Design a protein around this ligand. Structure first.
Ligand SMILES: [Zn+2]
Ligand SMILES: [Zn+2]
Ligand SMILES: [Zn+2]
Length: 178
């Protein structure tokens, strides 16, 4: 097994996957690493199994059909994995916890949003469709863009949104376009 957390790249109290060499902090894994379960398989391994059981699940899909999917167990898992892929980027730190807004010449967003909130919302089964999750995720980056205006700090929202969007297209097998 790896000697660092796959998500945050630090050592510590790690839980190892039984079917691949990754390791995780307890609350870095999404969902949080399960109390018992021997053997234990990480989210990466669980996502891989879905594809292997249904190879046609990798054929291209339209984003509009994906978004209307109900949050059955497989879609819940895919949204967890997508959220975890964002936490994997170190720039996710800026969007993890509850923000506050007091900058001359700017007003805060009407609906603040942050990664840990989305994580709670997933854990508590508050999203009934894929669209709910993806809307909250895109709202994080849109609020950041609007608030920071012409400050160069706006770029951090563009960068983390790009990680989100590439992983969304991969995980949900969105049809490739020009
Ligand atoms: Zn970690
Ligand atoms: Zn694994
Ligand atoms: Zn199949």
């Amino acid at each position: 097994n790896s000697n660092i957390c796959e998500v945050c790249n630090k050592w510590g109290r790690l839980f190892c996957c039984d079917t691949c060499p990754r390791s995780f902090h307890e609350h870095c894994h999404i969902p949080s690493v399960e109390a018992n379960k021997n053997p234990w398989s990480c989210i990466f391994c669980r996502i891989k199994t879905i594809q292997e059981r249904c190879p046609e699940s990798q054929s291209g899909h339209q984003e509009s059909e994906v978004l209307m999917r109900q949050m059955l167990p497989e879609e819940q898992l895919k949204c967890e994995f997508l959220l975890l892929k964002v936490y994997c980027d170190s720039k996710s730190c800026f969007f993890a916890s509850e923000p506050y807004y007091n900058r001359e010449g700017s007003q805060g967003p009407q609906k603040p949003m942050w990664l840990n909130k989305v994580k709670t919302s997933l854990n508590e089964q508050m999203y009934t469709r894929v669209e709910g999750f993806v809307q909250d995720m895109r709202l994080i980056f849109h609020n950041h863009k609007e608030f920071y205006r012409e400050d160069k700090f706006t770029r951090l929202g563009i960068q983390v949104q790009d990680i989100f969007e590439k992983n969304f297209r991969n995980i949900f097998a969105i049809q490739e376009t020009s």
